[PDB]
Every structure is written in structure tokens, then in C-alpha cells.
Scaffold this active site. Structure first.
Site, PDB file in Angstrom:
ATOM      1  N   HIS A  54      -5.219   7.754  -2.607  1.00  0.00           N
ATOM      2  CA  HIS A  54      -6.245   6.793  -2.151  1.00  0.00           C
ATOM      3  C   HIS A  54      -7.341   6.482  -3.162  1.00  0.00           C
ATOM      4  O   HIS A  54      -8.070   7.360  -3.605  1.00  0.00           O
ATOM      5  CB  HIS A  54      -6.880   7.263  -0.847  1.00  0.00           C
ATOM      6  CG  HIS A  54      -5.944   7.202   0.322  1.00  0.00           C
ATOM      7  ND1 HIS A  54      -5.845   8.206   1.254  1.00  0.00           N
ATOM      8  CD2 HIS A  54      -5.019   6.276   0.668  1.00  0.00           C
ATOM      9  CE1 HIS A  54      -4.904   7.911   2.129  1.00  0.00           C
ATOM     10  NE2 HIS A  54      -4.382   6.740   1.796  1.00  0.00           N
ATOM     11  N   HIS A  73       0.824  -1.195   0.000  1.00  0.00           N
ATOM     12  CA  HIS A  73       0.000   0.000   0.000  1.00  0.00           C
ATOM     13  C   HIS A  73       0.869   1.261   0.000  1.00  0.00           C
ATOM     14  O   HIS A  73       0.621   2.201  -0.756  1.00  0.00           O
ATOM     15  CB  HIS A  73      -0.895  -0.028   1.243  1.00  0.00           C
ATOM     16  CG  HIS A  73      -1.834   1.129   1.353  1.00  0.00           C
ATOM     17  ND1 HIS A  73      -3.117   1.085   0.860  1.00  0.00           N
ATOM     18  CD2 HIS A  73      -1.695   2.344   1.936  1.00  0.00           C
ATOM     19  CE1 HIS A  73      -3.729   2.225   1.127  1.00  0.00           C
ATOM     20  NE2 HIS A  73      -2.888   3.009   1.779  1.00  0.00           N
ATOM     21  N   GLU A  74       1.906   1.282   0.827  1.00  0.00           N
ATOM     22  CA  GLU A  74       2.767   2.458   0.862  1.00  0.00           C
ATOM     23  C   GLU A  74       3.571   2.607  -0.428  1.00  0.00           C
ATOM     24  O   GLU A  74       3.799   3.713  -0.898  1.00  0.00           O
ATOM     25  CB  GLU A  74       3.704   2.441   2.085  1.00  0.00           C
ATOM     26  CG  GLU A  74       2.998   2.344   3.443  1.00  0.00           C
ATOM     27  CD  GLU A  74       1.884   3.364   3.626  1.00  0.00           C
ATOM     28  OE1 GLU A  74       1.970   4.489   3.087  1.00  0.00           O
ATOM     29  OE2 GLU A  74       0.902   3.034   4.301  1.00  0.00           O
ATOM     30  N   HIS A  98       1.881   4.636  -2.934  1.00  0.00           N
ATOM     31  CA  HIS A  98       2.053   6.083  -2.799  1.00  0.00           C
ATOM     32  C   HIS A  98       3.408   6.480  -3.368  1.00  0.00           C
ATOM     33  O   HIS A  98       3.504   7.431  -4.142  1.00  0.00           O
ATOM     34  CB  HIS A  98       1.966   6.535  -1.334  1.00  0.00           C
ATOM     35  CG  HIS A  98       0.581   6.497  -0.766  1.00  0.00           C
ATOM     36  ND1 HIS A  98      -0.515   6.965  -1.462  1.00  0.00           N
ATOM     37  CD2 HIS A  98       0.107   6.080   0.434  1.00  0.00           C
ATOM     38  CE1 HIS A  98      -1.598   6.840  -0.719  1.00  0.00           C
ATOM     39  NE2 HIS A  98      -1.250   6.305   0.434  1.00  0.00           N
TER      40      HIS A  98
HETATM   41 ZN   LIG Z   1      -2.468   5.320   2.193  1.00  0.00          ZN
END
Ligand SMILES: [Zn+2]
Ligand SMILES: [Ca+2]
Ligand SMILES: [Ca+2]
Ligand SMILES: [Ca+2]
Ligand SMILES: [Zn+2]
Length: 169
Positions: free
Chosen positions: A129, A119-120, A123
Site C-alpha cells: 500500500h 490495484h490488485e 500487489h
Molecule cells: Zn490493496
């Protein structure tokens, strides 16, 4: 899905990563693997490739931190904010920080390092998101338990391929 404003992305296909330190919660082979698996997740759907550095400033620096560390956004103790990463770019950008006040596990008996890292690294690569509840980039971590059925949702695929395209087949 969604991207950061101005749609930041890495201008290069090959990115380097570096694990700055380790956590007392897990043996090191488990930390390396969760990071490597987290990266395969995005490789498989884009022409991006990653290699590792052990010195020097890599593009994506990974670290474990408690409270105040080297930036304006200190962590908040156990639970809640688990980790945070910066959008792609120079310096602090692309870097992923992890809260060591959480209990990182390979299993789902605490905070699974793989899922959060995956998930990171989203980014770090340019994805903000993604509103789909079934998507990896959805802001709410839930103690899944079924990592046996994990699949990057089409939304995540759509969103990361808008940035760098499909992988060469
Ligand atoms: Zn996040
Ligand atoms: Ca960086
Ligand atoms: Ca926390
Ligand atoms: Ca910990
Ligand atoms: Zn930080």
C-alpha cells in the site's frame, strides 16, 4: 510508495495470466477487457509483458469467490473487503481473488472491476500500500465516477519502476 518486506519481485519479465471463472454480474467481454486494461496500466511503465493461458497454472490466476474458497482468508459479504491479491512468488503467490458478493460493473454504479483489478495486480507485481492519497495503491477505494481522467500517479510509477525499471524506449 511501498514494497513488501524482503522486496519480492518476479525474476522474469514475461508473466502469464489466467481468468479461472466468471461473475454473473457482467458479460464475459467486459471481464476480459477490465483485466487486459488493468495489465496495460503496468506494462506502459515497465519492461514487463503479459500473455494469456486457458489451461495450466499461470503466474497470475484471477478468480471470483464468495465467503470461503481455496484459502485461509474468506471474503466478508457485500462491501468492505472487495478483493485481495498475494505477493509475487510460486503457487498461490501472484494470484488475485475477487469478492462476488460485490456488484462488479464497467461503470461506477457499483464496484468498478478495472480500478480494483489494476490495484490488485499491483500487489501481484510487488507493490504494497502506497501512502499517497492520490495513488492507485492507496488502500481506500472510493466510487470515483471519473475514470475518464484516470492516470497512474507518479508515486505508483516510481514504486513499480524501483522494482523493474522504466520501459525500453
Ligand atoms: Zn490493496
Ligand atoms: Ca501464482
Ligand atoms: Ca466484501
Ligand atoms: Ca456479484
Ligand atoms: Zn482468496
Amino acid at each position: 510508495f511501498r514494497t513488501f518486506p524482503g522486496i519480492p519481485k518476479w525474476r522474469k519479465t514475461h508473466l502469464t495470466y489466467r481468468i479461472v471463472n466468471y461473475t454473473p454480474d457482467l458479460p464475459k467481454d467486459a471481464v476480459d477487457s477490465a483485466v487486459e486494461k488493468a495489465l496495460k496500466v503496468w506494462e506502459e511503465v515497465t519492461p514487463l509483458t503479459f500473455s494469456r493461458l486457458y489451461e495450466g497454472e499461470a503466474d497470475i490466476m484471477i478468480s471470483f469467490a464468495v465467503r470461503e474458497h481455496g484459502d485461509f482468508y474468506p471474503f466478508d459479504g457485500p462491501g468492505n473487503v472487495l478483493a485481495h491479491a498475494y505477493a509475487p512468488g510460486p503457487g498461490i503467490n501472484g494470484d488475485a481473488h475477487f469478492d462476488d458478493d460485490e456488484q462488479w460493473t464497467k461503470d461506477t454504479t457499483g464496484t468498478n472491476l478495472f480500478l480494483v483489478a489494476a490495484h490488485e495486480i499491483g500487489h501481484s507485481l510487488g507493490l504494497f500500500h502506497s501512502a499517497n492519497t492520490e495513488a492507485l495503491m492507496y488502500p481506500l477505494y472510493h466510487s470515483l465516477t471519473d475514470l475518464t481522467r484516470f492516470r497512474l500517479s507518479q508515486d505508483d510509477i516510481n514504486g513499480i519502476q524501483s522494482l523493474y525499471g522504466p520501459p525500453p524506449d
